[PDB]
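Q: For a teaching session next week I want to show students how multiple molecules come together into a single three-dimensional assembly. I've collected the sequence lines for a complex. Could you give me the predicted structure tokens for the whole thing so I can convert them for display?
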Amino acid sequence: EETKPGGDNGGEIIFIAGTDVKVQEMKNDLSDIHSKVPLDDQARTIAGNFGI
Amino acid sequence: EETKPGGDNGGEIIFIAGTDVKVQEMKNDLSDIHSKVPLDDQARTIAGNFGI
Amino acid sequence: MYFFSVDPRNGASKSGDVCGSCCCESISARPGEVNGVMVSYAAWSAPLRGHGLTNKTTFEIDGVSVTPPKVSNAFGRTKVGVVFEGTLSDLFPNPEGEQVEYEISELNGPSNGVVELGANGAFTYTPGALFTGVDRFWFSINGNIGEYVISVDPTTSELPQPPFTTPVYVPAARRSVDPRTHVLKFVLGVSPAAIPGDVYRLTVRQVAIDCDGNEFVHISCYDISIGSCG
Amino acid sequence: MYFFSVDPRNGASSCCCESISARPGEVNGVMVSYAAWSAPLRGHGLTNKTTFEIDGVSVTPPKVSNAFGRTKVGVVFEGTLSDLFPNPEGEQVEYEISELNGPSNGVVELGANGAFTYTPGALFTGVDRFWFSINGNIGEYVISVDPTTSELPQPPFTTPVYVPAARRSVDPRTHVLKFVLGVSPAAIPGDVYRLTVRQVAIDCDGNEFVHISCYDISIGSCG
Amino acid sequence: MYFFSVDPRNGASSCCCESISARPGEVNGVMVSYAAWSAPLRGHGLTNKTTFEIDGVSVTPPKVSNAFGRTKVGVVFEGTLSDLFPNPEGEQVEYEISELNGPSNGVVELGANGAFTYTPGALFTGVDRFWFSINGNIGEYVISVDPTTSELPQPPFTTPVYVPAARRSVDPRTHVLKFVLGVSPAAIPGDVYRLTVRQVAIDCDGNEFVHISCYDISIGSCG
Amino acid sequence: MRTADRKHRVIVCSQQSDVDDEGRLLITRAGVIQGWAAIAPVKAIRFSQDGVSMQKDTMQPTHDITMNYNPDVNVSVSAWVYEHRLKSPPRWFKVLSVVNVDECSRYMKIRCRLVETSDDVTPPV
Amino acid sequence: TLLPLQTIREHAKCDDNPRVTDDLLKLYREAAFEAAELYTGLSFTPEKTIVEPIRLKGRRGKIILSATPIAGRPVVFYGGGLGSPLELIPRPGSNVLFFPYGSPDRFQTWGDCHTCDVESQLMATYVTGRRCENSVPAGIIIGILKLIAWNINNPGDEVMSVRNTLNANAQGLIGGTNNGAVISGAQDEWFRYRR
Amino acid sequence: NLDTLLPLQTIREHAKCDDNPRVTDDLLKLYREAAFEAAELYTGLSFTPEKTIVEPIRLKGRRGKIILSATPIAGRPVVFYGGGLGSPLELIPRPGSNVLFFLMATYVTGRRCENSVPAGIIIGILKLIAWNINNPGDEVMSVRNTLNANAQGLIGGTNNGAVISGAQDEWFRYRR
Amino acid sequence: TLLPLQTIREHAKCDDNPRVTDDLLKLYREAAFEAAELYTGLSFTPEKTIVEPIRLKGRRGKIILSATPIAGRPVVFYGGGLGSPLELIPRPGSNVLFFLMATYVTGRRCENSVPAGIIIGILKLIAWNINNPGDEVMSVRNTLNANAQGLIGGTNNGAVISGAQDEWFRYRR
Amino acid sequence: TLLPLQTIREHAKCDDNPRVTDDLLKLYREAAFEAAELYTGLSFTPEKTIVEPIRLKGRRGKIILSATPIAGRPVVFYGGGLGSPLELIPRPGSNVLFFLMATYVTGRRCENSVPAGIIIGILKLIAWNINNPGDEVMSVRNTLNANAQGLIGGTNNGAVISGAQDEWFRYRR
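A: Of course. Below is the structure for the complete assembly, covering every listed component.
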């Protein structure tokens, strides 16, 4: 925890003596929450029906 | 849970001391629910028949 | 509040949930309490498609164990506003020789007056001013509880004689029925003079009605057990 | 607390009555479980209509007699204790008053020769007792303080072995009878009394089922 | 603060009454949640028609008696403290005025031998109490100062365990009953009292649904 | 042995003898220990239709019984083992020797012999 | 009366070679009847009463009763913007119901500085249990008998472990399924009466 | 009623327990009437088949899927009616196939008649009752062996008390 | 009253060996009831009262109680911007509530409980600890091994290799 | 007073056969008791008091106490731009607080009421040590992959390859 921007040893390596700790980086894509493709199509339909 | 936007520790790491928990990130594509390819063809067909 | 699902009269599924010991359902009551009981005729009247239930319920109370009371009850009479005096020593004919611990419970005292317990079976009932009606209070002569009823007359002629409310009773008109969901509700009152240990039997005759106006009658019973401490 | 399981009246599994030991002065409790007899009679369990009777089979009549006194409220009471012990042989009368069984609402100061003065409790009316021991033999002296108006009635000179008037109880849920067994301090060791219980159950429709049993109360000392 | 969830009387879920511990001198508060019983009885909720009663199942009557006095405003009051403790035996008397239960609008110059004087506060009219202690026996001495015209009434000599006149409140929105339970500084440890509560409900039309429960107050020292 | 092998209810008995006044002897067998134990046979049995086993050497053990050790009890040369069953006749075992299993002081291994098995044996007092 | 002790013994071979006595046999039966008919979906634990504040869950108001009332007794709801109490009859088997979005009243208290007028939360009362019904369809009795047979000779000091996964667990650990009634053959005989 | 179509002597002679007093008649009866059903609901063909079954058929698709639950015995003209069908169309079905394509229909089902009982009971129920009488669920087993160490988790996933014998497999082959 | 010493000694078949006295058996019986209400959470703890400040959680104020006060006794809150106290009756079984100090009471030991489901796992756990200490890590059917690579592991640990842990899961969620 | 030697000789099955003298068992018991204290975090020696300057961490001042005071004693802060000292009632079980010197009380174990846990696992740890002088290898395998250097594996540790770890884990958060 003590490596965040504005920390004691930020940006330095983490050294662990024994007991291999296991880190896995979570993706958290979150770039298709609104489902871009099946959203603009409905926008187009309820717009074209109004004649725009 | 308490890492959502607006929690105690949002964006900070999760430390688990033993008993390895197993997360797997679901895709939830949901970007082809209306089947854009076999939808616009029918839109074109029911349009071309009307002469437009 | 008690709840009971009545048997549907289908020739099956009459076990439901029953640890069989008797026929009539069980109801536990404590002397002095006034509760409300619910019964759901949905299982029996819904297949009989018609106008649902009607407000023609009929109750009856009969005791299978009485253990007659020790102290008798009594009646008192006096006009409006005038102080009443009475004796409480004749109401306990005792077989053995023993003192008489007269007591007046503050929970079952009068409602429109006050009572001053004397030294030996005497009490003063000063009815509330500008009040006319009937009023009671429940004494306790050495553990045996009884009621003493007093009627204050509006100085014109007299008032009638009330019927000395029973140990267990169902009020005159405090029931109702919702034909939209087939549920009957009523009140179950137990006077403070009931003896713990006795058991009374309550029979309910509920009658439905068809689409045209004929009758579908239904009979069931319950065993109310007067037990102390709930 | 004594716990007796009654016989199930099924026609299957020294004396007849069970044994109950007692010590003069104790007020114990006895529990009886009628489950083995009233459970097959599926109904509404037990009812509060029990009935007791006490009768002796070996009494050893007492050497000392009892006495009854009377006085009003606030007024000091005086009495003697010499005509209470008719001695067959000629010996001395060593009077005594046990502090375990003294009075309850007063105090007693024993004289030099069978004399006592019971100053009643200030502002108290009713009845009081205390137990003397004339040469080992124990008897009771009852005093009734009257509330100065007319009089008070006469108490019944409590027996060696007794059952309280209204302290019995039954639990229809678990078929258990509870009653108390008190023994007077005047009970002589070695005596044997007999208690007979008539407990009545009830069927589902209100009829009656009667059951009778007996217990032999053996009055001993040191438990 | 105590809390009791009462049984809802549905034929469903050692002694009968619940347990309430108390310490001599305390004034505590109790909460009861009638929600489980009155919520199915859909009406206008609860009504402020609760009734209390205190009974004693173990008293150990008090050794020292209480007393009462009177004096005019501004005027000093003297009195005795020896004729209130009738002692059975002959021994010494160590009178003491407990500082924690002294007067509230004056001071008391406790003499050496059951004597004292009470100077009421300047320009004060009302009642004032203080709890003496003779050989460990605790009793109250009530003094009512008069506003020099005629008199004030005679207070009722507060009981060992009591519920105040009007400090109760019932929330009909959450079906919760609250009251105060004050225990006199004259309560004797080991005694047991019994408080019965009769709470009345109401329907939509204006009828009553009564409900009764009990509690066993056990006055114990050191909480 | 897993504690589920002990599936027999036994009564370890010590016998006392006293002379009958008419001229006989009488052996009284009283229980001292009762618990869960496991038996295992190591030799066949000749039955002799009254129950009594017809073993000739009368010193070769036929059954081996394992029980929980107990350091204060001293299983003698005059100890018996009364084993009772549910719908079979009880058994009278006479001990011949003990084994302190691996000297771990956890289980006793008692080499015993089957004396008799019939519905008319004298239970211990 | 439903499962005889002699039948249990004759199934589990405890006959003239008697293991732990009838007291533990009847305790094992009382626990096998809280394991079976609690696994398949039935229920027990007679009359009991629960007062419970209910919390709004969902836009249309899913309400999860944390004690699954009996089958049809009206659970009464009150408080929480609800001026007058209302009953709700639940569906048997599950505890998920719906708060009727049609509201009967809203007794709000706009304006207050002693409580800052936030809310008194929604509360409810109900009962759970059953009078008495215990049922054991012939065919689901074999799993109960097998569980008893297993628990007679598996007291809990002997190591038994069947593997569920094939690779490993995570660490140098001996797999694991050590439950009972599954290494006993009861789960796969009660599955036939499970949806 | 489970007594005339499979006598207890048959079980005792198959499982060779005629001299076992530890298996009483009531225990063997419980096993027998728990077995018949054990597999009967599973895929027990339709043991006790003869039974007039009603069915609220629900239409699907253009070809009118009228898929059934238990085909009439062979070609019994099941009467079709109700659910928008006045005329009681007694149409003879396809033997052995319930998913038909033309609502309500009642039909006497079951090739019981002359006590059909072809295979599945005769083999599977005997094998399973034998397994249940001589193999209670208390210890895991192995192939023709009492236990294999294997130094890891036991393989006793099914061989504990499940249907390992060819009983359920004959049930398979008859459902087929 | 929950576990009589006669049942455990007759279940574990350990009554004729003085190596297991009543005191050591009591320490065992206390170790199987503190782990039954801690893996399944039925609170076999007596009445305790916790004074505990609550800290805000989120925009709508999640409040998690660190000691789960009974089922429905109203926990009172005060301080931290709250000018006047207010009560709150929590979830039975869980402590996740929604909106600084707080005060509440925890603790069972009342009209006793623990149905047959838990007692089986409890007796199974004690049957383990009496004759399976931390030495001689075992293998199949309580045997040993000579595995050239290593050993099998996780065998001599309690309540997991036998009974309780999976005999208690039926009361979880 | 927490654990008598008689409990060791009765649980570890060495009452009849000693297998070890008494002072070595005393050294063993101290070893097993000095191992659980620092593995679980919970302090020990009847109470303690630590004076500890706290260092700011974060923009809102996340402050973790290196000794997790008991449950509710107000910790005092002073110095380092903090003009006037002020109290702070901390989290029980955790030490993460939010806002330089500090002084407070430690020693969760003020009384002697270690409920059931640490006693049992230590009994398992001792039973492991009584017969394990370090002569046999007694190593158990770890995660599947055989180490590339090709040893016999790792994790051959007292109080770890026994039940101790699985025992006092229901307290470690």
